[PDB]
Amino acid sequence: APADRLKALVDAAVQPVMKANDIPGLAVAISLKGEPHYFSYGLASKEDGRRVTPETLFEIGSVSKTFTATLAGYALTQDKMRLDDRASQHWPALQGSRFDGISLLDLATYTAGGLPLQFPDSVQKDQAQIRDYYRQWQPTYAPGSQRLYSNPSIGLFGYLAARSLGQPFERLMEQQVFPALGLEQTHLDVPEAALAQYAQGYGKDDRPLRVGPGPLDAEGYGVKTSAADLLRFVDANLHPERLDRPWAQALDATHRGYYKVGDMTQGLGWEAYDWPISLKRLQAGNSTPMALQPHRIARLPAPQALEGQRLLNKTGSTNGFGAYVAFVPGRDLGLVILANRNYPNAERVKIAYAILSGLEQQGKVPL
Ligand SMILES: *[B]([O])([O])C1=[C][C]=[C]C(/[C]=[C]/C([O])=O)=[C]1
């Protein structure tokens, strides 16, 4: 069985990284032909020696954007919105602004014209300040020309998706998306009954950190989930057809690529690579420059189905937490790495690659 070699492989990938980045706790979940394998390391909380388990809740940060994309997928396949809709079509308070000339697709894929990585400090979690921010916003770049990774960009995408469905974003996620995907350990707001499972996050000098409120936090970076639940989400992405048709279609909608930057094809939330690919190249696709700097896009003649021999991934970080997810449809392989430190993306990719590559090499013919 390929499973027989997993424990040694995962320990080897994980433990050196945990040591070098002083990571208090880390959970791995791997799906091999739909069968889950869990590896838990260290402490969810140092103050009270609570061990990480597959049910420990971590902040997954921007991995939340794949859930947001799924809600948007559902809106799209229910004909509540279309990707070439003007943004202001779904929020009348934006009519007259730059959002008259920006598409939903632009927002979704960070190409609206240089919406920043995060809202300025001064924008509070308040409909009217958010509205006013977008009403006064002026672009850096022409739309559809430059990718600049952006919470306010895809955050507005998610918010407008919710508006097209006629319900608050948080309500749709909690009452329709999470249940559709069979996720009972996944939260935007961790309830009373589950607080005991919420890991502590650790920042510089081991400052304890859990994510605070912010504008469009639910849409951009607000999910808390367990390694076991996030692997259920990954398995739903590997086999959407196992869901009821509306939700199967919603997931398929997130697996469509619109443009390339270097080796990376941008989907809705998901970012995709050809598989196999080299470690160095996967790291560069997930680099600090990819996250922080503008990049010229190579637009595709037509949206590409992100299927077959490809790797789809998303990193996610908060002040206290560092997550990574990946799946490879042509290997029926899913992977989740959740940690309670924000440690470098390159190290997350190192772990994931050791695992993916290790499994790849058992499937060779001897001599
Ligand atoms: B991801 O994770 O990538 C992101 C982006 C942007 C922003 C954010 C926020 C965070 C906190 O605050 O935590 C995220």
Side-chain angles (χ1 to χ4, degrees):
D4 297 339
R5 280 157 182 281
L6 254 199
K7 173 72 167 145
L9 212 72
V10 172
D11 281 6
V14 169
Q15 293 206 346
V17 169
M18 290 187 64
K19 178 62 155 180
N21 299 278
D22 196 3
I23 303 176
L26 186 156
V28 177
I30 301 168
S31 184
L32 247 181
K33 310 213 159 158
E35 291 311 315
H37 303 271
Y38 301 116
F39 310 86
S40 306
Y41 300 88
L43 298 176
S45 168
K46 287 197 306 199
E47 64 258 24
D48 53 51
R50 210 173 51 249
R51 285 256 156 258
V52 169
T53 78
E55 281 76 46
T56 300
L57 297 177
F58 293 85
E59 295 169 6
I60 69 177
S62 292
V63 175
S64 303
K65 294 169 170 62
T66 66
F67 288 90
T68 297
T70 304
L71 178 56
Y74 177 76
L76 287 161
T77 56
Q78 298 297 114
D79 302 313
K80 294 299 232 273
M81 65 184 228
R82 307 166 45 173
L83 282 175
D84 57 5
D85 292 349
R86 299 165 153 54
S88 59
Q89 180 199 315
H90 294 280
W91 196 7
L94 295 192
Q95 281 160 196
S97 69
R98 298 318 210 102
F99 289 95
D100 291 338
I102 289 161
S103 69
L104 291 185
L105 176 64
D106 299 328
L107 291 178
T109 62
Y110 315 115
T111 53
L115 278 168
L117 169 72
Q118 187 52 293
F119 292 97
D121 278 18
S122 52
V123 183
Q124 282 140 258
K125 192 189 168 55
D126 179 67
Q127 202 203 30
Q129 289 188 43
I130 295 164
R131 176 203 75 204
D132 291 346
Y133 172 78
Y134 290 117
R135 284 199 57 67
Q136 61 85 60
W137 178 82
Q138 296 306 308
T140 308
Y141 316 104
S145 55
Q146 294 268 337
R147 182 183 187 270
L148 184 74
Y149 180 70
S150 169
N151 205 69
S153 188
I154 193 169
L156 178 59
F157 178 67
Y159 188 77
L160 294 179
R163 284 187 72 90
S164 82
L165 285 167
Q167 279 208 75
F169 182 84
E170 294 82 346
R171 180 186 300 145
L172 286 167
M173 296 301 300
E174 287 164 340
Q175 292 184 182
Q176 276 163 258
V177 178
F178 296 155
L181 297 168
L183 307 181
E184 292 159 33
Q185 298 170 16
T186 297
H187 311 286
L188 291 176
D189 286 280
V190 171
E192 169 76 308
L195 275 166
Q197 289 307 137
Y198 195 168
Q200 184 61 264
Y202 298 95
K204 195 136 179 286
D205 296 303
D206 297 351
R207 184 182 297 278
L209 286 175
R210 291 188 177 103
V211 67
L216 294 197
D217 56 356
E219 295 85 342
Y221 59 90
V223 175
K224 298 98 198 170
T225 190
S226 63
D229 251 21
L230 191 55
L231 189 63
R232 288 190 269 271
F233 180 61
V234 172
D235 288 341
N237 280 275
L238 278 163
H239 299 296
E241 71 276 1
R242 314 229 161 107
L243 299 187
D244 301 322
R245 182 215 184 196
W247 293 105
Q249 291 177 315
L251 293 166
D252 291 335
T254 67
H255 302 163
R256 313 196 79 242
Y258 289 96
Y259 64 74
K260 293 190 51 164
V261 174
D263 289 319
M264 188 270 294
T265 300
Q266 181 69 63
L268 308 187
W270 300 105
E271 294 171 21
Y273 298 86
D274 304 326
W275 183 256
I277 193 174
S278 85
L279 166 61
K280 169 189 302 190
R281 284 167 148 250
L282 186 54
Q283 278 173 328
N286 284 291
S287 73
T288 282
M290 280 289 303
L292 293 186
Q293 287 180 26
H295 285 82
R296 300 163 44 53
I297 67 171
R299 188 165 294 274
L300 288 179
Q304 165 75 79
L306 302 176
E307 56 175 14
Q309 309 301 309
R310 287 179 170 85
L311 183 148
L312 282 71
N313 77 352
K314 191 64 189 72
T315 60
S317 296
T318 64
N319 292 326
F321 293 80
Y324 181 73
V325 295
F327 61 97
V328 181
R331 297 294 181 278
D332 203 356
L333 208 157
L335 166 81
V336 166
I337 309 159
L338 300 183
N340 59 359
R341 186 179 304 280
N342 182 351
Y343 71 103
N345 276 358
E347 299 278 84
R348 300 173 200 188
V349 171
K350 197 167 113 192
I351 298 171
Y353 188 87
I355 297 170
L356 267 19
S357 168
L359 286 174
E360 195 76 5
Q361 284 176 145
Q362 281 148 213
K364 296 334 173 184
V365 174
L367 208 144

